[PDB]
Amino acid sequence: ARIAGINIPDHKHAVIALTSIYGVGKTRSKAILAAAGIAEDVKISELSEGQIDTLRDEVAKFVVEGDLRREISMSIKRLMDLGCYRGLRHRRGLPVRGQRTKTNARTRKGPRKPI
Amino acid sequence: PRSLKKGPFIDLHLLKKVEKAVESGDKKPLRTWSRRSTIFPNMIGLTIAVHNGRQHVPVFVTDEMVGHKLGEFAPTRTYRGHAA
Amino acid sequence: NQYYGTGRRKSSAARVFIKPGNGKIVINQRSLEQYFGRETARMVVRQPLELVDMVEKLDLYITVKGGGISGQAGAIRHGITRALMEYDESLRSELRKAGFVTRDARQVERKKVGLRKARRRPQFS
Amino acid sequence: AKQSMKAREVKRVALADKYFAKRAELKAIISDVNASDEDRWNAVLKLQTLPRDSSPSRQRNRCRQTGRPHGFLRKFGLSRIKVREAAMRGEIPGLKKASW
Amino acid sequence: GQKVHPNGIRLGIVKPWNSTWFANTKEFADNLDSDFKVRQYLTKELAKASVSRIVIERPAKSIRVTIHTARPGIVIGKKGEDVEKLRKVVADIAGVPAQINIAEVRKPELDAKLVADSITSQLERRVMFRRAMKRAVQNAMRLGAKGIKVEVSGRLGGAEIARTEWYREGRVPLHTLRADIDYNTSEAHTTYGVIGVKVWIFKGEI
Amino acid sequence: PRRRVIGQRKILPDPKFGSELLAKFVNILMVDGKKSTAESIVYSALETLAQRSGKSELEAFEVALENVRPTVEVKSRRVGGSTYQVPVEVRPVRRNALAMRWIVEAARKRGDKSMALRLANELSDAAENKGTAVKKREDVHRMAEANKAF
Amino acid sequence: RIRIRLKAFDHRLIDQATAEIVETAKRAQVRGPIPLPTRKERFTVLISPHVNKDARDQYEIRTHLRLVDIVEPTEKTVDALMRLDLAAGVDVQISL
RNA sequence: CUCAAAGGAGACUGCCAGUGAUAAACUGGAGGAAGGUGGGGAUGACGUCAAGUCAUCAUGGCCCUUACGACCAGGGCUACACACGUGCUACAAUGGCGCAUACAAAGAGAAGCGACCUCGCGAGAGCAAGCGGACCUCAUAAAGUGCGUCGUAGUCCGGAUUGGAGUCUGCAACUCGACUCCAUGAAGUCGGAAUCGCUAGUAAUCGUGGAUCAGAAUGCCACGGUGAAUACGUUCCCGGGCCUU
RNA sequence: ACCUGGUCUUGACAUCCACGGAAGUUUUCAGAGAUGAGAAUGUGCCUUCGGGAACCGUGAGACAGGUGCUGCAUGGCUGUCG
Ligand SMILES: [K+]
Ligand SMILES: [K+]
Ligand SMILES: [K+]
Ligand SMILES: [K+]
Ligand SMILES: [K+]
Ligand SMILES: [K+]
Ligand SMILES: [K+]
Ligand SMILES: [K+]
Ligand SMILES: [Mg+2]
Ligand SMILES: [Mg+2]
Ligand SMILES: [Mg+2]
Ligand SMILES: [Mg+2]
Ligand SMILES: [Mg+2]
Ligand SMILES: [Mg+2]
Ligand SMILES: [Mg+2]
Ligand SMILES: [Mg+2]
């Protein structure tokens, strides 16, 4: 129900439900469940409180949620403070991985802004 | 990124210059065209002027800069915005 | 003695051996049902025998290679038709009327330069 | 292509042939896991010293007749235009217009 | 519109290849380059020898070159002196042992390459283009050509506006693959610029 | 076409029920040449329909078809500054083609979870003259009735 | 056993060369000539000097392949095959 | 027997009936694998657009010649308020995912294709056969099918973007490579006016290979699998041919 | 093929002439490299022991070079109506 300071969906299968945690994807979700000895198909509601506690211990092994967000924020901040090319791209809100900017790049640039 | 087994890449001429500069003491900024050379721990505290294609841009190496290529800190294209 | 026919459809080539038997069909050392999951494929294979009413009167040993399930089924049907005509000449007239005798000459049309496919043209403005 | 551009290719081929054995040695040292880290480091530095034109990747296939750097075909060693001219004259053995 | 090369379309139908050797991908490009350099040398060397076609064969590790010339004597030289000189040069170019065979071309008026070369020579000599073309057509038809077409393109008569002029007599069925069409081209280099000549000679079906 | 040299293309009868009409319906439902997928939907839908219908699958399908088939349709003809919808009798082959296409279109627009369920529901509604497919037939007839003068 | 692989760009030339080999060997037992699959190498080139991407020529070189098997070769037969000179344009590979 | 690839056979409006000017021809029929151009391709008249290409090359003239020539390093051709063309991937349940399991064609390969085995989550690495190839290798067909699950949600749809960690090629991947792993999880719920392709093994959809190439395809060229709908017709719109005005 | 900077001027690429050096091979330092300054090792091939030519240089000057312009001076090739 409540893991890593968030509420996971009870109705969903455990493997899907765990992915609700930031920093946990399908692979990590499967690993956590395998370590906890809980089947992926089992719904969170079906799991006992003891079973939920085992899941909580497994999640604690990986950096997740706020701790992950802090790490990601610091990494981007470092680049921007460095003034490296990547940092400059983060500052300008342009693609950082050498994609084209003549067209596209709408995800970084946002909606088209008329001249 | 360059394979770990191959190790970090630096141009030999730059490496020699850095070693000489470190041995000599505080020095006038090193002038290099080797944008591709990785920044090494020994370089920290040295100013390296990296060519951006038209001018050598002074870079003061710091601990955070280590493990990055020199060219990363010298911008090749100039853009001040459209209709600016 | 075994009566033999060769059937071809698309890129498939089928070798059919027909002998007096009791409605047993083997394709590439597998039962018809096993080899062909699709009902249509099975229907195509059994079409000639049903027409001649010799479904349970003969045993068929069939080997087919190349193409796909529909091609192989069509090739087998052609081969069976040929074998049936070898077994009995009179059957030809009925088989011809069914259109089993004709070898289907339709093939994949080649891709052509300046075209996305055989006929599909790039979008025009 | 300009005469100089054709000349540059001739130099690149020559240098590549000259240092082929040396380059292969150095690359093998760098590649080998068993080789010492110091040995690898020296090999990496030595490879840099060798002339850039010695690397085969620097060479660009050019039409042997014209020196055209695009539309090259390896089989004939000619660009598409020169291939076509030779083919029509019957100079390229076995080669004819094809339909299927 | 544009037309298919008449020789190229007929290759392996009624027209033979000029080069007839087998090579793997490894040697194919080198053989083509050697053939080019051999043909380049021979064309320059035998410019006045009325060479129509140079056939190159590569049996074993040797090169056999067959030169088709209207004037066999001049190519051969005195006691085969000239041909021997050619052989030595070809061997150097080829880098393999060279054998030179000289084939006489009878009826040079019926040979497209020779006709084209004649016309271009005349144009360089400042002979009037129309006269050169008309004579060529007449000569071929007299020699029993079933048809001939001659086309000349460029600054004809040194005109500022380039134009194309052509004359045809008899049948010249370019769409008929079995028809034996000898086609060849030549370029005249003049003070006004390049003039292109194309000649088609029909010698009957098959 | 102008030449009008078009000839009939043979349709193999559907395997389960041996009906050419049902084979046409599979082709109309089919997308991207996936006939096997299409056949599964139709066979599933017909079975579900048959249970509710209490009739043979072919009979149930035929009852649905009878309700959706159009006797008359409108063809546009431009007359000067106006365009006239001209009523035309639908030939028997086209009547089936329209009925099947409309049923499939209607089924595709339904909100049921699977296409087989949607198709069964559409087919059942048509038997009782209630679905969007039957409404299209109603609209076509009304348009033809309105333009009977032309 | 001697295996001879013949390759030519011309089918007529290869057939003549095989016929010479089989006859010469017959004057040891021979298997075939076996018609091995012809390789068709196709090439596509733009035919304009500039642009016109849809304007192309498609070329093909067909490599014809023949296999002849010389079984229980006589010493004379072996020499006779070596002495035999096939037409130029036929590549001959002899396998023992 | 399949197949390989050489040489042959076969289709001719040849046969039959009707129609037509005792015509050409048309229509139907028989036989036949194939029927009237059997399917596809190559093949492009005289000419038109002073159409495209002096940057493939060649060439008249003009121009530069210690420079408009030549060499080198670094940068650029990858820029980014924006507009357009051509594509790719989607918006899901005729689907996604998991597991199991069928059936191709075509092609490439020696500074190459590289098995097996071992190692790595993987990209790969190490070791090392075979193959200049109907032999060996690339190399797994995928859609499909069975079973299970998901249950109409911005989702177990979508996979953009970004962080971190790697691999490989290459002197060298900062500008500016491909790929892998973990995490992240954008727009998008079927698209205004308008507009494109396609008449059958076609469209649609599904994979496969090749050239270029150290590396770098959603492009191009090629290959099979599955496999439709519809054509009443010629009033209309558009273009073309012929005769006439 | 563009830019910035560093460089060369019979020249990166040809023919010719004179002159000196086999060609080459292995290394050092400086330089971003181009390149320059060095060192060491080869010194053959032909050869009427006249020699040549192999290929390095150096020095002229005839020349080389140009993806510089004109596709409205052209050839060739191509699209297009079709
Ligand atoms: K997550
Ligand atoms: K010019
Ligand atoms: K970019
Ligand atoms: K694309
Ligand atoms: K890069
Ligand atoms: K590549
Ligand atoms: K008119
Ligand atoms: K032109
Ligand atoms: Mg296809
Ligand atoms: Mg295109
Ligand atoms: Mg390259
Ligand atoms: Mg113009
Ligand atoms: Mg550069
Ligand atoms: Mg570009
Ligand atoms: Mg007409
Ligand atoms: Mg023009």
PDB file of C-alpha atoms in Angstrom, chain F:
ATOM      1  CA  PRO F   1     -13.367   1.800 -66.221  1.00  0.00           C
ATOM      2  CA  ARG F   2     -14.015   3.155 -69.728  1.00  0.00           C
ATOM      3  CA  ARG F   3     -13.113  -0.221 -71.279  1.00  0.00           C
ATOM      4  CA  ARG F   4     -15.418  -2.118 -68.870  1.00  0.00           C
ATOM      5  CA  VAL F   5     -13.523  -5.402 -69.347  1.00  0.00           C
ATOM      6  CA  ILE F   6     -13.666  -6.283 -65.624  1.00  0.00           C
ATOM      7  CA  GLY F   7     -14.287  -9.955 -64.734  1.00  0.00           C
ATOM      8  CA  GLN F   8     -15.312 -11.790 -61.542  1.00  0.00           C
ATOM      9  CA  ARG F   9     -12.630 -12.932 -59.072  1.00  0.00           C
ATOM     10  CA  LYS F  10     -13.297 -16.328 -57.447  1.00  0.00           C
ATOM     11  CA  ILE F  11     -13.857 -16.284 -53.669  1.00  0.00           C
ATOM     12  CA  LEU F  12     -13.080 -19.536 -51.827  1.00  0.00           C
ATOM     13  CA  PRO F  13     -16.015 -20.447 -49.506  1.00  0.00           C
ATOM     14  CA  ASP F  14     -15.504 -19.981 -45.761  1.00  0.00           C
ATOM     15  CA  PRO F  15     -14.012 -23.191 -44.254  1.00  0.00           C
ATOM     16  CA  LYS F  16     -16.377 -23.745 -41.299  1.00  0.00           C
ATOM     17  CA  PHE F  17     -19.763 -23.067 -42.967  1.00  0.00           C
ATOM     18  CA  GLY F  18     -18.806 -23.285 -46.673  1.00  0.00           C
ATOM     19  CA  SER F  19     -20.430 -19.917 -47.496  1.00  0.00           C
ATOM     20  CA  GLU F  20     -18.994 -17.517 -50.096  1.00  0.00           C
ATOM     21  CA  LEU F  21     -21.094 -14.726 -48.537  1.00  0.00           C
ATOM     22  CA  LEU F  22     -19.427 -15.291 -45.149  1.00  0.00           C
ATOM     23  CA  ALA F  23     -15.998 -15.354 -46.832  1.00  0.00           C
ATOM     24  CA  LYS F  24     -16.773 -11.919 -48.310  1.00  0.00           C
ATOM     25  CA  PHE F  25     -17.719 -10.697 -44.819  1.00  0.00           C
ATOM     26  CA  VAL F  26     -14.352 -11.892 -43.451  1.00  0.00           C
ATOM     27  CA  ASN F  27     -12.558  -9.998 -46.246  1.00  0.00           C
ATOM     28  CA  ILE F  28     -14.503  -6.814 -45.415  1.00  0.00           C
ATOM     29  CA  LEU F  29     -13.671  -7.177 -41.695  1.00  0.00           C
ATOM     30  CA  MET F  30     -10.039  -8.084 -42.434  1.00  0.00           C
ATOM     31  CA  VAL F  31      -7.283  -5.486 -42.049  1.00  0.00           C
ATOM     32  CA  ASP F  32      -3.668  -5.708 -43.320  1.00  0.00           C
ATOM     33  CA  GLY F  33      -4.174  -9.139 -44.954  1.00  0.00           C
ATOM     34  CA  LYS F  34      -4.609 -10.854 -41.552  1.00  0.00           C
ATOM     35  CA  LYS F  35      -7.414 -13.201 -42.631  1.00  0.00           C
ATOM     36  CA  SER F  36      -6.780 -15.662 -39.771  1.00  0.00           C
ATOM     37  CA  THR F  37      -7.376 -12.927 -37.176  1.00  0.00           C
ATOM     38  CA  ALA F  38     -10.478 -11.800 -39.094  1.00  0.00           C
ATOM     39  CA  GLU F  39     -11.905 -15.337 -39.312  1.00  0.00           C
ATOM     40  CA  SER F  40     -11.467 -15.793 -35.550  1.00  0.00           C
ATOM     41  CA  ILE F  41     -13.539 -12.660 -34.833  1.00  0.00           C
ATOM     42  CA  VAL F  42     -16.324 -13.648 -37.246  1.00  0.00           C
ATOM     43  CA  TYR F  43     -16.540 -17.259 -36.014  1.00  0.00           C
ATOM     44  CA  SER F  44     -16.518 -16.121 -32.380  1.00  0.00           C
ATOM     45  CA  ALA F  45     -19.148 -13.461 -33.135  1.00  0.00           C
ATOM     46  CA  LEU F  46     -21.402 -15.876 -35.050  1.00  0.00           C
ATOM     47  CA  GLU F  47     -21.338 -18.444 -32.224  1.00  0.00           C
ATOM     48  CA  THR F  48     -22.265 -15.785 -29.644  1.00  0.00           C
ATOM     49  CA  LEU F  49     -24.989 -14.565 -32.016  1.00  0.00           C
ATOM     50  CA  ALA F  50     -26.286 -18.111 -32.591  1.00  0.00           C
ATOM     51  CA  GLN F  51     -26.678 -18.764 -28.848  1.00  0.00           C
ATOM     52  CA  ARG F  52     -28.749 -15.594 -28.356  1.00  0.00           C
ATOM     53  CA  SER F  53     -30.525 -16.061 -31.707  1.00  0.00           C
ATOM     54  CA  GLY F  54     -31.406 -19.736 -31.193  1.00  0.00           C
ATOM     55  CA  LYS F  55     -30.764 -20.182 -34.935  1.00  0.00           C
ATOM     56  CA  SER F  56     -27.959 -21.530 -37.139  1.00  0.00           C
ATOM     57  CA  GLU F  57     -25.105 -19.046 -37.626  1.00  0.00           C
ATOM     58  CA  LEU F  58     -25.809 -18.663 -41.359  1.00  0.00           C
ATOM     59  CA  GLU F  59     -29.527 -18.062 -40.692  1.00  0.00           C
ATOM     60  CA  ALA F  60     -28.743 -15.479 -37.985  1.00  0.00           C
ATOM     61  CA  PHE F  61     -26.269 -13.635 -40.236  1.00  0.00           C
ATOM     62  CA  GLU F  62     -28.821 -13.691 -43.067  1.00  0.00           C
ATOM     63  CA  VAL F  63     -31.499 -12.145 -40.812  1.00  0.00           C
ATOM     64  CA  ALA F  64     -29.070  -9.337 -39.922  1.00  0.00           C
ATOM     65  CA  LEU F  65     -28.238  -8.856 -43.620  1.00  0.00           C
ATOM     66  CA  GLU F  66     -31.911  -8.654 -44.645  1.00  0.00           C
ATOM     67  CA  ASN F  67     -32.419  -5.712 -42.263  1.00  0.00           C
ATOM     68  CA  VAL F  68     -29.300  -3.763 -43.360  1.00  0.00           C
ATOM     69  CA  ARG F  69     -29.519  -4.323 -47.153  1.00  0.00           C
ATOM     70  CA  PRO F  70     -30.590  -1.239 -49.203  1.00  0.00           C
ATOM     71  CA  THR F  71     -33.056  -1.617 -52.104  1.00  0.00           C
ATOM     72  CA  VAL F  72     -32.414   1.926 -53.426  1.00  0.00           C
ATOM     73  CA  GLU F  73     -29.590   4.510 -53.128  1.00  0.00           C
ATOM     74  CA  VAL F  74     -28.775   8.065 -54.326  1.00  0.00           C
ATOM     75  CA  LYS F  75     -26.153   9.060 -56.944  1.00  0.00           C
ATOM     76  CA  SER F  76     -25.151  12.734 -57.349  1.00  0.00           C
ATOM     77  CA  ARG F  77     -25.672  14.484 -60.713  1.00  0.00           C
ATOM     78  CA  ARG F  78     -24.661  18.141 -61.148  1.00  0.00           C
ATOM     79  CA  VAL F  79     -27.290  20.206 -62.990  1.00  0.00           C
ATOM     80  CA  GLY F  80     -26.123  23.764 -63.714  1.00  0.00           C
ATOM     81  CA  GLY F  81     -25.713  25.678 -60.445  1.00  0.00           C
ATOM     82  CA  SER F  82     -27.073  22.764 -58.377  1.00  0.00           C
ATOM     83  CA  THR F  83     -26.405  19.055 -57.738  1.00  0.00           C
ATOM     84  CA  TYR F  84     -29.292  16.557 -57.801  1.00  0.00           C
ATOM     85  CA  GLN F  85     -29.260  13.340 -55.764  1.00  0.00           C
ATOM     86  CA  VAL F  86     -30.710  10.783 -58.201  1.00  0.00           C
ATOM     87  CA  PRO F  87     -32.281   7.569 -56.788  1.00  0.00           C
ATOM     88  CA  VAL F  88     -30.857   4.377 -58.286  1.00  0.00           C
ATOM     89  CA  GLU F  89     -31.823   0.751 -57.641  1.00  0.00           C
ATOM     90  CA  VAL F  90     -29.037  -1.180 -55.886  1.00  0.00           C
ATOM     91  CA  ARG F  91     -28.076  -4.360 -57.784  1.00  0.00           C
ATOM     92  CA  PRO F  92     -28.119  -7.563 -55.637  1.00  0.00           C
ATOM     93  CA  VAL F  93     -24.335  -8.055 -55.259  1.00  0.00           C
ATOM     94  CA  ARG F  94     -23.875  -4.420 -54.163  1.00  0.00           C
ATOM     95  CA  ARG F  95     -26.755  -4.789 -51.671  1.00  0.00           C
ATOM     96  CA  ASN F  96     -24.755  -7.449 -49.815  1.00  0.00           C
ATOM     97  CA  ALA F  97     -21.535  -5.430 -50.124  1.00  0.00           C
ATOM     98  CA  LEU F  98     -23.142  -2.334 -48.592  1.00  0.00           C
ATOM     99  CA  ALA F  99     -24.883  -4.326 -45.846  1.00  0.00           C
ATOM    100  CA  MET F 100     -21.661  -6.054 -44.769  1.00  0.00           C
ATOM    101  CA  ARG F 101     -19.545  -2.879 -44.953  1.00  0.00           C
ATOM    102  CA  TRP F 102     -22.096  -0.965 -42.855  1.00  0.00           C
ATOM    103  CA  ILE F 103     -22.305  -3.748 -40.259  1.00  0.00           C
ATOM    104  CA  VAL F 104     -18.500  -3.822 -39.909  1.00  0.00           C
ATOM    105  CA  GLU F 105     -18.285   0.000 -39.769  1.00  0.00           C
ATOM    106  CA  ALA F 106     -21.039   0.082 -37.130  1.00  0.00           C
ATOM    107  CA  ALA F 107     -19.397  -2.711 -35.118  1.00  0.00           C
ATOM    108  CA  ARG F 108     -16.035  -0.909 -35.203  1.00  0.00           C
ATOM    109  CA  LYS F 109     -17.640   2.253 -33.757  1.00  0.00           C
ATOM    110  CA  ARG F 110     -19.287   0.345 -30.857  1.00  0.00           C
ATOM    111  CA  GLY F 111     -17.863   0.581 -27.320  1.00  0.00           C
ATOM    112  CA  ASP F 112     -17.757  -3.135 -26.372  1.00  0.00           C
ATOM    113  CA  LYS F 113     -14.385  -4.502 -25.222  1.00  0.00           C
ATOM    114  CA  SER F 114     -13.567  -6.812 -28.179  1.00  0.00           C
ATOM    115  CA  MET F 115     -14.405  -6.691 -31.910  1.00  0.00           C
ATOM    116  CA  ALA F 116     -16.088 -10.120 -31.735  1.00  0.00           C
ATOM    117  CA  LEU F 117     -18.368  -8.831 -28.966  1.00  0.00           C
ATOM    118  CA  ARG F 118     -18.979  -5.585 -30.888  1.00  0.00           C
ATOM    119  CA  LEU F 119     -19.759  -7.539 -34.070  1.00  0.00           C
ATOM    120  CA  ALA F 120     -22.152  -9.898 -32.263  1.00  0.00           C
ATOM    121  CA  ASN F 121     -23.963  -6.978 -30.615  1.00  0.00           C
ATOM    122  CA  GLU F 122     -24.182  -5.115 -33.943  1.00  0.00           C
ATOM    123  CA  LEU F 123     -25.398  -8.285 -35.684  1.00  0.00           C
ATOM    124  CA  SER F 124     -28.001  -8.946 -32.961  1.00  0.00           C
ATOM    125  CA  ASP F 125     -29.241  -5.333 -33.087  1.00  0.00           C
ATOM    126  CA  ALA F 126     -29.614  -5.578 -36.881  1.00  0.00           C
ATOM    127  CA  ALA F 127     -31.793  -8.688 -36.494  1.00  0.00           C
ATOM    128  CA  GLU F 128     -34.069  -6.552 -34.281  1.00  0.00           C
ATOM    129  CA  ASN F 129     -33.659  -3.466 -36.537  1.00  0.00           C
ATOM    130  CA  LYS F 130     -31.979  -1.244 -33.921  1.00  0.00           C
ATOM    131  CA  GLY F 131     -28.267  -0.675 -34.727  1.00  0.00           C
ATOM    132  CA  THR F 132     -26.403   2.145 -36.528  1.00  0.00           C
ATOM    133  CA  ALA F 133     -26.057  -0.139 -39.571  1.00  0.00           C
ATOM    134  CA  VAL F 134     -29.867  -0.360 -39.821  1.00  0.00           C
ATOM    135  CA  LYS F 135     -30.019   3.423 -39.288  1.00  0.00           C
ATOM    136  CA  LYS F 136     -27.713   3.925 -42.291  1.00  0.00           C
ATOM    137  CA  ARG F 137     -30.065   1.789 -44.406  1.00  0.00           C
ATOM    138  CA  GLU F 138     -32.960   3.908 -43.085  1.00  0.00           C
ATOM    139  CA  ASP F 139     -31.161   7.154 -43.982  1.00  0.00           C
ATOM    140  CA  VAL F 140     -30.282   5.910 -47.487  1.00  0.00           C
ATOM    141  CA  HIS F 141     -33.929   4.956 -48.112  1.00  0.00           C
ATOM    142  CA  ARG F 142     -35.218   8.303 -46.795  1.00  0.00           C
ATOM    143  CA  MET F 143     -32.820  10.222 -49.067  1.00  0.00           C
ATOM    144  CA  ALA F 144     -33.970   8.126 -52.044  1.00  0.00           C
ATOM    145  CA  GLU F 145     -37.642   8.681 -51.135  1.00  0.00           C
ATOM    146  CA  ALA F 146     -37.096  12.449 -50.908  1.00  0.00           C
ATOM    147  CA  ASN F 147     -35.473  12.491 -54.367  1.00  0.00           C
ATOM    148  CA  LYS F 148     -37.995  10.123 -56.007  1.00  0.00           C
ATOM    149  CA  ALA F 149     -38.918  13.036 -58.308  1.00  0.00           C
ATOM    150  CA  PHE F 150     -35.440  12.830 -59.897  1.00  0.00           C
TER     151      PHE F 150
END
